[PDB]
RNA sequence: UAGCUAGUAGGUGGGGUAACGGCUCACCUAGGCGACGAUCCCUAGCUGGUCUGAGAGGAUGACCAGCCACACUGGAACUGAGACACGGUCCAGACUCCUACGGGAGGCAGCAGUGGGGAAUAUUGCACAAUGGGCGCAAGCCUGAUGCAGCCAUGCCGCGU
RNA sequence: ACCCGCAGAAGAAGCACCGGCUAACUCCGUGCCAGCAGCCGCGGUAAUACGGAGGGUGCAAGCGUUAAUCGGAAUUACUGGGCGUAAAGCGCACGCAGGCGGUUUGUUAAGUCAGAUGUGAAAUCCCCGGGCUCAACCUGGGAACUGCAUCUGAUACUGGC
């Protein structure tokens, strides 16, 4: 899966997926792909729809100032 | 056993010539000699000499076949739940193909080689190779 | 071929209506053993002349009532 | 079918005698055998007897050049067999028509062989050719049967006839536009690839 | 085991090479993608494959996988299920072919035609 | 209302008719009653021959059963009675 | 015969000082009759060093094959463990399809006239070593009355 | 599905078919029935034989022969022995049509063909030439029975290629 | 049907596989992707496998797919499979059914042991001939008659007695 770039920051995480609210605002339940991993809810992400289901194939998690185990 | 007496007389047999227990002794029925009858003259034994029929003896003498156990073969198969001799020979034969097996006709209880072979049917009463 | 059989009836209080047994054997046969396979018919009986181990032969007949198509016909023995 | 194929390459991956590139260069030369043919494909041969016995028998059945579809109903009928199913299959299959145009010197390659009989080329005294498919009997004047009497093929093949697989058993000659099968193709002669607890071997569930 | 034991109850010949229930019967169906959709594989296989869910006509809402490289429309578009699951993928049970029929060809593959590739014309 | 009537049987154009008795009845075939004979119109050898085995026939027509033209063939086929 | 087989040699598993080691230890058969094959465990640390040593082992004890037709003399079983196997006495020329597990041994033997096959296991370890248990057992016969008039 | 019976059975008698027989009523008797598995439910039409499997067995039931069951909704008799007849009997009806619209009227599990269904599989076919069966006094006639041929790798064997 | 002429094969290879296994694998895109991929898994792997190219395998007018069966699976064991612990002693009994009990002769002859004969239809199956263009396609002949069905001898066996 591929789609078309776009800007989201990651309202929730679907569990399995995550969902995206775009930069629009426009939520999509979206796929997170194996390529990408440094994603988390807040993350601003090149998500991307099919060609919902979206994808997502790139974050924006900037830095630390909170963790787990360390994450 | 308790309830199926070739069966046990086989296996006492088996447990007989296993621990080449060359003779083996335990009561006739009529049909234990008969069939111990055929076994001495079959070599398997090669005699069995009687003593009782509701009283107790019938002394086989297992051979060596050949140095080697004389019965490498022999087993129970005619529990009260089973039976598969009809007439007119509609009893073949299993293992009877190397042994005896003894069987069963119009009367008595003979080589089976006889009356199976014979199409006397025989009833297959017991078995051997 | 026959069809007089020397059944059994053995039926009774069953009011002139009692039962022969022309029985049988089946044999469980694929995984062993021997059963019966059985028939009874309300033979000639008839007033019950098939009676209590009356060991009665019957000939097949017409019926001559529901089931009194085995006609009795003899009765051989008693048995226990 | 003939079951349609090109005669040089193919002599050299199946490596055997089939009875094919009939004329005046066959196999290898001007362009040898075992050198390849392929280039990609046959790079890591993932054999296993399956390979084995498949070429076995595959050259057997190529040497007759017989359809797979036929091939089979040879082996069936020598399988009813009370017999050792094999051998009797051999002589069923050699038996026929086809594989008895080029054995008479008509035929030589299987295709050219059935070539003739195929367009109604070459005769039997064999239930109307028009087929190789057919199988020929014990005297057949396997003959020639017209555009082929001691043509090019046939004349050169009653030569090769001779030598074919020799046929001790049918009368090779194509000479005479004949070509008398005296008698069924037995293992009196072999041209075999498979043994009979190969192949016997081979075929099984 | 006493023989009459046994009898009473007997105790089964047929087969035996049973896993999990599978379903209908009708050589093909008459079905059209409920919705092209996709899903994963595995992990290390590490890829993405694209399927369909699938309503046909001789049972069963069947979700089908649309193969080798790509997939059909979505929606209903016109699709074949030529039947399928996977090795790799547990409780599938009818597919969506392509380089066969009513669906997309299956694109950009043509290393096979009765299967994959194109849906050459059945000559 | 028994009736022996021609089968027409053997794979068509060659049929390999084979004179059967059946109740007439059966507009060509249906129900069979007995078979009793061939007549094979086309290249055979043997155990697959033409046959006429006109006894039989008799003993069934006497109580009333009927018989065909190509029986007709079969009857007076060597003139085999004819 | 006058053949042996080398059946297989073995990649076991040690499991070692260090790392886990794997062999080549071989069971191979051998006959040189039918009246003889033998078949030894070898161990080693190669494809031939585990054959060898088999073969060796192998050519130890060569013993009994299809006596009678290049047949049993009569069909015999064989369990080993838990081994179903079946092997009779016929012809060759009423066929064999020959197995391995009957004409691997047989073919060492020489011998084909045996048909064979086993239920169960996908074991050569215990079944083709149950297939020779259900080999050998053939017996040694003496008479048209052997057990008969022993 | 572990429960049965009053038409129940039997007895008994009428009654009935041709007729057997509760078989049925009349009466009575109490009979009269199932856990060797009944009752109950479905499902399957069912066989020679199909399928497969070494077979065991298992499967199978074809794409036949043999037999049936069954052939517009429900009901309902006939001729005829037989048929309450896939295109022989009455209504409702269903059902749809007829219909001056009431009344009525109207129907390929024969076929193609039609609808179209479903994965999808058959000509509005030819043919009596023979084949059969019928009718027809019969002659003949009839015969989508039938022959021949139409339509589909679906299923087989080949030459070819 | 059959029969045969002509030229040239004209008008006749695709299709499936090929990462193993499994008949067949590379080269390249992809390539931890997009994918393949029966089964194992192949997918970074510069592919083998993906994806393609090419090459190889494996087939014939076919060659693949689906739906889809008994088989192997001894995988439910009849043949032929399983309770010390791998899916196998009831908590434990009792215990009716069930089943099963010694023993001895005698005895039924029923079962069995001996027989009879009929009866399996046909296909003519198989077997084994046979028929046609091989073959497919047509038939026959031994073989489906078993068991039913029934008789009976022997009677030890087995049960009857």
Redesign the pocket.
Same mark, same amino acid.
Do not use: W
């Given at each position: 899966?591929?789609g078309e770039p776009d800007e989201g920051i990651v309202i929730s995480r679907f569990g399995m997926h995550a969902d995206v609210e775009s930069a629009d605002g426009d939520v999509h339940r979206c796929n997170i792909?194996?390529?990408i991993r440094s994603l988390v809810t807040g993350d601003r992400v090149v998500w991307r729809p099919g060609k919902v289901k979206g994808?997502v194939e790139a974050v924006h998690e900037r830095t630390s100032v909170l963790t787990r185990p360390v994450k | 056993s308790?309830?199926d007496?070739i069966a046990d007389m086989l296996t006492r047999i088996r447990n007989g010539q296993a621990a080449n227990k060359a003779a083996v002794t335990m009561?006739?029925?009529?049909?234990?000699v008969?069939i111990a009858n055929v076994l001495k003259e079959e070599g398997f034994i090669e005699d069995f000499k009687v003593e009782?029929?509701?009283?107790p003896e019938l002394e086989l003498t297992l051979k060596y076949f050949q140095g080697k156990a004389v019965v490498e073969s022999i087993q129970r198969v005619?529990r009260?739940?089973l039976?598969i001799?009809?007439?007119?020979?509609?009893?073949p034969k299993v293992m009877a193909g190397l042994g005896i097996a003894v069987?069963?006709?119009?009367?008595?209880?003979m080589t089976d080689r006889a009356?199976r072979q014979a199409?006397?049917?025989?009833?297959?009463?017991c078995y051997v190779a | 071929?026959?069809?007089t059989?020397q059944g059994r009836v053995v039926?009774?209080?069953?009011?002139?209506?009692? @039962?022969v047994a022309i029985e049988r054997? @089946?044999k469980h046969?694929?995984?062993?053993?021997?059963?019966?396979?059985?028939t009874?018919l309300?033979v000639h009986?008839?007033?019950?002349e098939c009676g209590i181990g009356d060991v009665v032969e019957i000939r097949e007949?017409?019926?001559?009532?529901?089931?009194?198509?085995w006609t009795l016909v003899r009765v051989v023995e008693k048995? @226990? | 079918?003939?079951?349609?194929?090109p005669k040089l390459?193919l002599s050299r991956?199946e490596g055997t005698d089939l009875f094919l590139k009939s004329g005046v260069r066959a196999i290898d030369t001007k362009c040898k055998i075992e050198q *390849?043919?392929?280039?990609?494909?046959?790079?890591?041969?993932?054999?296993?007897?399956?390979?084995?016995?498949?070429?076995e028998?595959?050259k057997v059945?190529?040497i007759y050049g017989?359809?797979?579809?036929?091939?089979?109903?040879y082996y069936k009928e020598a399988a009813?067999?009370?017999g050792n199913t094999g051998e009797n299959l051999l002589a069923l299959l050699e038996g026929?028509?086809?594989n008895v145009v080029y054995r008479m010197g008509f035929g030589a390659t299987?295709?050219e062989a059935?070539?003739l009989?195929?367009?109604? *080329?070459i005769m039997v005294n064999?239930?109307?050719?028009?087929?190789?498919?057919?199988?020929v009997s014990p005297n057949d004047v396997v003959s020639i049967?017209?555009?082929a009497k001691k043509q090019s093929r046939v004349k050169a093949a009653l030569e090769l006839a001779e030598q074919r697989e020799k046929p001790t058993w049918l009368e090779v000659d194509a000479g005479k536009m004949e070509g008398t099968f005296k008698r069924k193709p037995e293992r009196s002669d072999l041209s075999a690839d498979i043994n009979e607890h190969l192949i016997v071997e081979l075929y099984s569930? | 085991?006493?023989?009459?034991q046994?009898?009473?109850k007997?105790?089964?010949?047929?087969? +035996?090479?049973?896993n999990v229930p599978?379903?209908?019967?009708?050589?093909?169906?008459?079905?059209v993608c409920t919705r092209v959709y996709?899903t994963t594989?595995?992990?290390?296989?590490? +890829?993405? /494959?694209?399927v369909c869910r699938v309503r046909?006509?001789?049972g069963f809402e069947v979700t089908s996988?649309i193969?080798?490289?790509?997939?059909n429309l979505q929606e209903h578009s016109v699709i074949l299920?030529?039947?399928?699951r996977?090795?790799?993928?547990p409780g599938v /049970?009818?597919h969506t072919?392509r380089?066969?029929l009513d669906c997309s060809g299956?694109k950009?593959?043509?290393?096979?035609?009765?299967?994959?590739?194109?849906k /050459?014309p059945? +000559? | 209302?028994v009736?022996?009537?021609?089968?027409?049987?053997?794979?068509?154009?060659?049929? !390999?008719?084979?004179?059967?008795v059946?109740?007439?009845?059966?507009?060509?075939?249906?129900? !069979?009653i007995?078979?009793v004979g !061939?007549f094979?119109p086309?290249?055979?050898?043997?155990?697959?021959?033409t046959?006429l085995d006109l006894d039989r026939i008799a003993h069934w027509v006497g109580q009333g059963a009927?018989i065909?033209?190509?029986?007709a063939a079969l009857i007076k086929e060597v003139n085999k009675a004819a | 015969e006058l053949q042996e087989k080398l059946i297989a040699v073995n990649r076991v598993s040690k499991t070692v000082k260090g790392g886990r080691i794997f062999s080549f230890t071989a069971l191979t058969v051998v006959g040189d009759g039918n009246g003889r094959v033998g078949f030894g465990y070898g161990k080693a640390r190669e494809v031939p060093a585990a054959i060898q040593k088999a073969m060796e082992k192998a050519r130890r004890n060569m013993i009994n094959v299809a006596l009678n037709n290049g047949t049993l003399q009569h069909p015999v079983?064989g369990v080993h463990?838990?081994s179903?196997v079946?092997m009779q006495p016929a012809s060759e020329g009423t066929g064999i399809i020959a197995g391995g597990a009957m004409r691997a041994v047989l073919e060492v033997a020489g011998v084909h006239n045996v048909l064979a096959?086993?239920?169960?296991?996908t074991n050569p370890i215990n079944v083709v070593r149950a297939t020779i248990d259900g080999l050998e057992n053939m017996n040694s016969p003496e008479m048209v009355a052997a057990k008969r008039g022993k």
């Open positions: 899966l591929f792909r194996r390529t994808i | 308790m309830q007496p009561p006739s029925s009529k049909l234990k008969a009782g029929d509701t009283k005619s009260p739940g039976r001799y009809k007439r007119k020979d509609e009893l069987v069963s006709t119009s009367k008595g209880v009356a199409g006397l049917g025989g009833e297959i009463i | 071929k026959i069809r059989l039926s009774d209080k069953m009011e002139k209506s009692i @039962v054997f @089946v046969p694929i995984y062993g053993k021997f059963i019966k396979r059985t009874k309300h009986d008839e007033n019950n007949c017409r019926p001559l009532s529901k089931t009194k198509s048995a @226990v | 079918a003939r079951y349609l194929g390459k991956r *390849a043919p392929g280039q990609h494909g046959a790079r890591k041969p993932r054999l296993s007897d399956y390979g084995v016995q498949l070429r028998k595959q059945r190529r017989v359809l797979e579809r036929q091939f089979r109903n009813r067999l009370k026929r028509l086809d299987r295709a059935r070539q009989v195929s367009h109604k *080329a064999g239930r109307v050719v028009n087929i190789a498919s057919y199988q049967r017209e555009k569930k | 085991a006493t023989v009459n046994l009898v009473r007997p105790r089964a010949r047929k087969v +035996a090479k049973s599978a379903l209908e019967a009708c050589p093909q169906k008459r079905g996709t594989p595995k992990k290390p296989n590490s +890829a993405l /494959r694209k046909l006509t001789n996988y193969g080798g490289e790509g997939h299920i030529r039947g399928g996977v090795k790799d993928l /049970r009818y072919v380089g066969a299956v950009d593959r043509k290393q096979a035609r009765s299967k994959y590739g194109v /050459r059945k +000559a | 209302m009736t022996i009537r021609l089968a027409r049987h053997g794979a068509k154009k060659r049929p !390999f008719y084979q004179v059967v059946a109740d007439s009845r059966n507009a060509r075939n249906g129900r !069979f007995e078979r !061939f094979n086309i290249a055979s050898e043997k155990e697959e021959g046959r009927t065909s033209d190509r029986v | 079983k463990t838990g179903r079946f096959k086993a239920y169960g296991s």
